[PDB]
């Protein structure tokens, strides 16, 4: 079920970058740079992501077409208004 696996990875990570979650997720926001980017390694270590894959290359594949998040090099951010969310590390 690799297509379903990719969809579950996408939905879980798009949840972390939803406004509903970001409002309260200080740990995640303290890991952003000033552009909102944080390492995909951090996301890949979260328990719900580990429950789907331990292979970070499948995460990149699952997110390739996301309209919520944007991947640059090995980091990911929320696309919309990215500077609203970072917090002092
Ligand atoms: Cl885990």
Numbering used by the authors: 322 to 410
What does the article say, verbatim?
The LaM alone is sufficient for binding poly(A) RNA with submicromolar affinity and specificity. Multiple high-resolution crystal structures of the LARP1 LaM domain in complex with poly(A) show that it is highly specific for the RNA 3′-end, and identify LaM residues Q333, Y336 and F348 as the most critical for binding.
Crystallization trials with RNAs between three and eleven nucleotides in length produced seven complex structures, including non-isomorphic structures with the same ligand. The crystals show density only for the 3′-terminal nucleotides and can be classified into two groups based on the stacking of the first and last base. The LaM appears to act as a rigid scaffold and the differences between the structures largely arise from differences in the conformation of the bound RNA. To facilitate comparison of the complexes, the nucleotides are numbered from the 3′-end: A(–1) to A(–4). Analysis of the nucleic acid backbone angles confirmed the rigidity of 3′-end of poly(A) RNA, which results from tight binding to the LaM domain. In contrast, a large range of angles, including syn glycosidic angles and C3′-endo sugar puckers, were observed for A(–3) and A(–4) nucleotides. The structural heterogeneity suggests fewer structural constraints and weaker binding of these nucleotides.
